[PDB]
């Protein structure tokens, strides 16, 4: 069960860590999806092309991987996100944390 949080808190986490956040596209080239959420990112290494996940610059993706190290994912599992609603995204994970 991957604990669900923002990319900028990706760092408070321990390294081997499953977690699981949403992110925008800055770049997907040669196996690496460069993420951004505000002025956060994070790189996420998309070891293995399997089928079904098309990515395209600047669209939102919910990653699920585990923390390599600081600012680096490995990816399990990469689902879409189009048309999420962010900001009440950002309001349902912080209720989660806040408890």
């Given amino acids: 069960s ?3 949080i ?3 808190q990706i760092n408070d986490c321990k390294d081997g860590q499953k977690l699981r956040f949403l992110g925008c596209v800055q770049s997907y080239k040669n196996g690496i999806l460069r993420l951004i959420d505000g002025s956060s990112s994070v790189t996420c290494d998309v ?3 399997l089928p079904d996940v098309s990515i395209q610059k600047h669209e939102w993706l ?4 585990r ?3 600081d600012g680096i994912v490995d990816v399990l599992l990469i689902r879409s996100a189009v048309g999420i609603n962010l900001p009440r995204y950002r309001q349902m994970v912080s209720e989660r944390q806040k408890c």
């Fill in 67 to 69: 923390k390599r190290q």
């Fill in 62 to 65: 919910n990653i699920v991987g």
């Fill in 2 to 4: 991957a604990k669900l």
């Fill in 6 to 8: 923002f990319i900028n």
């Fill in 47 to 49: 070891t293995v092309v």
